[PDB]
Amino acid sequence: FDELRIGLATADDIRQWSHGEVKKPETINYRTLKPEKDGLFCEKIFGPTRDWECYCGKYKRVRFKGIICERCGVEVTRAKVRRERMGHIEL
Amino acid sequence: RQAITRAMADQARTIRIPVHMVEVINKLARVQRQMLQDLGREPTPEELAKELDMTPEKVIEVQKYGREPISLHTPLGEDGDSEFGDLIEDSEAVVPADAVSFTLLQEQLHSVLDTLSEREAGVVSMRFGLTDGQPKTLDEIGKVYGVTRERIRQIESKTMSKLRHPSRSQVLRDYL
Amino acid sequence: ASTAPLRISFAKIKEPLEVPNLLALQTESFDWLLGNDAWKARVESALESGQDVPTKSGLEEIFEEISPIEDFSGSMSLTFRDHRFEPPKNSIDECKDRDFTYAAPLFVTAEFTNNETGEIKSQTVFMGDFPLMTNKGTFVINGTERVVVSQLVRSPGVYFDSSIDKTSDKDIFSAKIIPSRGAWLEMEIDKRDMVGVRIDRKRKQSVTVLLKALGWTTEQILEEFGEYESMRATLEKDHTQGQDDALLDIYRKLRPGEPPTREAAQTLLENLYFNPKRYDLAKVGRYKVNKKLGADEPLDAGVLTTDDVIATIKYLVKLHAGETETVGESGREIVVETDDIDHFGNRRIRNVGELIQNQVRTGLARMERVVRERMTTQDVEAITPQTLINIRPVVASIKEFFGTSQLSQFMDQNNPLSGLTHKRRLNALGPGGLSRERAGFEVRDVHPSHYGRMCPIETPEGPNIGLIGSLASYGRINPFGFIETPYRKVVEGQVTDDVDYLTADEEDRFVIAQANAALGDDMRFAEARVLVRRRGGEVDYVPGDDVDYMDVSPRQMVSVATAMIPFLEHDDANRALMGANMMRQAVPLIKSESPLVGTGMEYRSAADAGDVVKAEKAGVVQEVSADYITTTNDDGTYITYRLAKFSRSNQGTSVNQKVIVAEGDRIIEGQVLADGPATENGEMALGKNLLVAFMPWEGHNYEDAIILSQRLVQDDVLSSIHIEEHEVDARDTKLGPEEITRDIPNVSEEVLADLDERGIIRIGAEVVAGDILVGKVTPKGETELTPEERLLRAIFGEKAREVRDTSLKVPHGEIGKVIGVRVFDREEGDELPPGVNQLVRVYVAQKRKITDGDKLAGRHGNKGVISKINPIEDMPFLEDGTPVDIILNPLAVPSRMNPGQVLEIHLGWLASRGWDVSGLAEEWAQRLQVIGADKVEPGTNVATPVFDGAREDELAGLLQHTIPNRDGERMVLPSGKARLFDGRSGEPFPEPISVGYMYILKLHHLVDDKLHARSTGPYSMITQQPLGGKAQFGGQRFGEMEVWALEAYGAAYALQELLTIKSDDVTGRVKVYEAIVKGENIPEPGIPESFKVLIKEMQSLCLNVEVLSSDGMSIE
Amino acid sequence: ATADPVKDYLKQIGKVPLLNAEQEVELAKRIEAGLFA
Amino acid sequence: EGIINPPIDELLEATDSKYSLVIYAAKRARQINAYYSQLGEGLLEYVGPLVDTHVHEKPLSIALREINAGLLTSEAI
Amino acid sequence: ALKRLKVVSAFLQTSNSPKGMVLDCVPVIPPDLRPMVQLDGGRFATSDLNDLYRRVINRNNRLKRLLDLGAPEIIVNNEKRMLQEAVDALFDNGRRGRPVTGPGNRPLKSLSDMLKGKQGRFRQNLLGKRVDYSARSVIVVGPQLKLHQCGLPKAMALELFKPFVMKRLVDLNHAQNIKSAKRMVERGRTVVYD
């Protein structure tokens, strides 16, 4: 903490911040009450809803953290990453 | 009308409802409005169920599925006392009492295991994954340690007995 | 006769008029709205008595205003002729218990008629349930008693304003027509030496274009307006001429972007104003505009006409020219003058009837649009009244009114006085009216009109000061919505026993006297000089026979709450205001006692309040009991009244009702049988009366704190029951259902000791914080046992089961004996909302005694927190050994400027010890003898009306002539003080001390409810800081000024901890808790979470807010 | 460019020639002509 | 036996300021608390209370007691 | 010309190009900061940013579909205008004409609105924060106290000092272990008050 530089955020910078692309307005399935795919709240882009728990029922334990499951693409980690990770919308 | 109805079904509600569920909910809603008009009273669930021809469980299911969210950023009731999004608690917050109690449990358990013999404490630890989140089966332990699956089973049983003595049980009882 | 218990009256002047039904404001308004038998009965009674009254009801009127729907072909018509009600299905206690809005069916006969078919088809249709009002002016909705409070609004009509502009150096005059519903229009004159019109303030325009657009031609315009040069100048400077040219110009200005069209513009102008629907001026609007503009009998109900607009123009120019009297346009001569908005003739109360009527009107308008749409999309011969009308809008409007509205306010049942004061309030805040932000200085300030119409003493002291006020004692509502007041009739200097009701405007013309003015033995004035008031609030005197009207009772200007205070006249207005606000918070006690000294009006306030239970027949009681009382009228009808017992009110206070009548005592209609909360023998009793002595005492009553004996704790003198109700519901989630069972998991055995079979706490079982009221268990959950939990379970051989404990427990800091439990089951015949299979409510009732910290207060705005409760001996006792029950700091009363409390204390002492005055031949003795309050036994109560109280001479004389209480000596000296023996030291105090009996109240600002602490508790979600409130373990807010003060000290590390460790940092909170418990030193703070929230938020506004270090990138 | 964009949309519709029968059948005829083209 | 038991004036004249006194006594209190929570490592760097100590005490009371006695000294880097 | 010189020179000296005026990609707030949190009773809690992001995503999708097929200039231009209005409402709802009222009862919240005003982040959750380890109650007068003494009722003192009371209870062996100490303080036995 020495200086909070602030300035215009170009398109390249916003792409750099984003960990993915949001392509749908879907939020959560009305029955399973889980985030849908690649919409808002998507785990593939933002993060896992439950600690280290992916979406598809595959790798589901604290031991094997720091890997991406090829089924749903969720990167197992702490749920707190959902408070940091941010996406973007291409117009 | 087709495009308007389709897109109203697919983009009007915050929680996306599938089109067949949209037509089911709107059908039961309009027919319920009708029966309110004729009977002049709130219809009973069984009458609604026989009207829709489905079972009451489906009636309750769709009735609960046909709601809408309430916005957090709304007047909570007073003039300006924050909003509805500043009165409900979260579940992901780590209750510090729980965290410190769990850490104390970890310390006490580790000390009690250290009380036991080195091999005994080790085998029980792997059997219950106290070093790593994945406990190892009896045979699973009998590779790095070099003991037979029934041998490791036996010493695991003796460890279970030893820790079950009243000696190393007064402290751990109170943590449940 | 036997209506009220005997209360000696110190009043000097007889009152011809009796106080009306104090709750008339709500009951009569809703009677009118329903148009039931009562409203029409009063209508015919007034008609045969000659009194004016609206002879058309409320509901039927709004139905009739809806003309039959006409399609584009106009072939079809629906007639809503007659509306009717049916008895409600649910009883009132029933509706309260199972949470049903107390409503009744509402049918109406719809008649279908088509010219093409030439046939009439009549069929009855049901519009929906209608929230009905109980006899005590409340709407029991969803089990909670709401009350709809009146609303003050600016009446529709014309209003002229005079102002001064500093730049212009000359006066500026404006006019505004405020419609009931439609769009608004303004007419400013000589803004810059010309007159112009604001059609919704769309654009700059002149008056000449408007007149030309109308059929009125220039020649007659200048003929009528050639006598004023300003308007001639406006006419000549206007280059445009011709009706078509002006009309197209104004149409283009109003709706630019399209070519002007004659028919479209004419239709637009007709639609905006002349259409009866868009500009529906209320009956009050036309009623007042005809009187103001002076037009002699215009159309009784209708829209503004061109004649009205020209009349307003002429009125405005006449006002501007300086002429003060001018011939009315098509009317008599009238004064032309500016009118102030704040005058109470311009202010109208929207009683409950009108509010509910307006909401029904909006719902019916939506219904009209819906049926018109259906008619446009429906085939003939398949159209029926049953099928076409949609009833959703009416029900969905009358339901969205009573809930989610400022005017439908939660009842406050702290006591009967609070009930009445909630019923009679006139909330200026609300939809379509003066909001909190819109408040100014003028509206809050009292006006000379507020005399007998709106109590100026009492009002909330908060930011909404003065906006909300209580209706005066004798106030009554004009049918147009104005407030009337009663005045006696005076003729040739002789005040007559005849009464007339005057509104806020009619009062101006006449000159009104003062009720306090004395009168001779004959009915004439005793003194030629008499105080009077006149136009503009002037107070000048007018001796001799010149007045015509006088106030009927001196308490006209004071509401019920303020009227209760005795010796009000001696108190400052501020302290009387605070004493009126406080008297609406006294909680009922275990045993209530009527004031020894009080106004003579508490009987009426108690009786007309709905809490008390009075008889509807004159018979003989046959069975008296705590739960119920049975009576037998001479006719033969047997009626049993059920007395509520310890049923929770809205404020969590008991409503225990006692019984006064014996077995064989005769009864009269309206007589009182059972007291209510804070009542005694039908007399209001908001508290107890204590022996008070004024003296500083060791500083424990410093800064207005209070010292009271342990006698009050000992004898339960100040003790109040409090019943809390918390409930839990067995809902079904996606995993499964919830079970209410005694078999709660992961618990000990003794915790579930007092539970019932199905997991409900027994009745009569004392509880404490943490006790289990009802045992509930979650269906299941995905449990991934942690390694430590796995090992521990293996060791102890316990099976951690998917079912998880979620039982209801008493919130922290609580105590009480359960008094009742109610269970509602889905599978049973009872109905519940969707999902909830079972619902359980438990009542926990405690007897809070008076303790330290509790807020106490008297009637005159003297309040204080208890600071110490000395034993009975430490109290400085009197010459006969009686300890004083309460000490109060004298230092309050001089600065507080409320010496009325000292008067009350002396008169309370006088009331406690009787007096005998016979043949004394003294002036005060003569006054007492003629009044009839001469021979008074000890203990009986005494009455001093609010503005005819006992003169100080009376108090002095009675003090001289008190009854000797013991041994033949009077403990109080003629000065009204007494010798106080210090209880602790024992020596007599150096000088006498003032003592007497003062009425104190136990406020609802109890300490137990305020107390709250927090080690660590719930945390918010969007920002991880702790959340607020007491119910959720909320940490106090460290506002901006706190951090400013801490910076002023130079304390930086305390600020760091109070901002990062003690909130807003998830990593640091667990660490600090661990370090404190382990004893390790506090760890270094990190960064706060709210800062990361902010940087992420300003990252999402396309501002690359980057945190950088001096040497390149930083470490975080 | 004004507030309540629907008003500007309605103006953007403006005045266009409503189609009577022969007009629109001829338009559809040239539509199918262009389709084959 | 109170917050005001060590009077402040001696501490100010000892440390020549008031804020410096707060931070310096706080550092000493931290050191004594770290010593009291050693629980067995016995690091040579840590130094226990120089003045007598009660069976249960706050570290800061002892730190300020040491300042009042004056045996403790500070030195800015 | 002075104002023009100020802004143009401010852009010239700074390395960033002016084209940041016209954004191409819209960042979306992390979901946890706009929670669609579950509520008991089958109901839901949604923050208005969810609605505004849904609106912009919907309009962008519709614009893409309209561009994919050969579409008239009028419809596509009105669609781009709709997208512009949606983005403007997202960043600042109510800065042009009527606001995006959403449900109709109240204007929807927007990104800038959370960063502004009395209830904004700057003045409500960065300068003045709520704090743990605190309490509140009515105050009475105590004369017998000395100048540096204040009285705390039993309950408030016990609740404020929970960690310290736990540590002292475990150290004196009044309680066996930490969890038992928690249970005993919650019970409120006399030894806890001592």
Ligand SMILES: [Zn+2]
């Ligand atoms: Zn997966």
